[PDB]
Amino acid sequence: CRGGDEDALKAARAIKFLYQSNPPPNPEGTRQARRNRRRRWRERQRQIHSASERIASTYLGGMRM
């Protein structure tokens, strides 16, 4: 869980550049790979393309992205 916002992308990109550039030793660990390459829609409404919520601290089944 990082955050959905215009400014958020700016910060995330800063670190992302390092992540993509010369990544860590993961020969048998493409977890993030599949995590990024995927499409899923579990919403029954489209009002705004931006998660207003900042941080979600809930343990109702699932980990913290």
Distance from C-alpha of 27 to C-alpha of 24, rounded to nearest angstrom: 9
Question: Is 65 in contact with 2 (CB distance < 8 Å)?
Answer: yes
41-46's contacts with Cβ under 8 Å and 24+ in sequence apart are none
Token output for 56: 């979600």
The radius of gyration of the chain from alpha carbons, rounded to an integer in Å, stands at 15
Token output for 51: 């998660």
Token output for 11: 């910060």
Residue the block writes with tokens 């020969």:
27
Token output for 25: 């030793």
Q: Using what technique was this structure determined?
A: NMR
Question: Is 62 in contact with 1 (CB distance < 8 Å)?
Answer: no
How wide is the angle at C-alpha 6 spanned by C-alphas 51 and 46, nearest 5°? 35
Residue the block writes with tokens 């670190």:
15
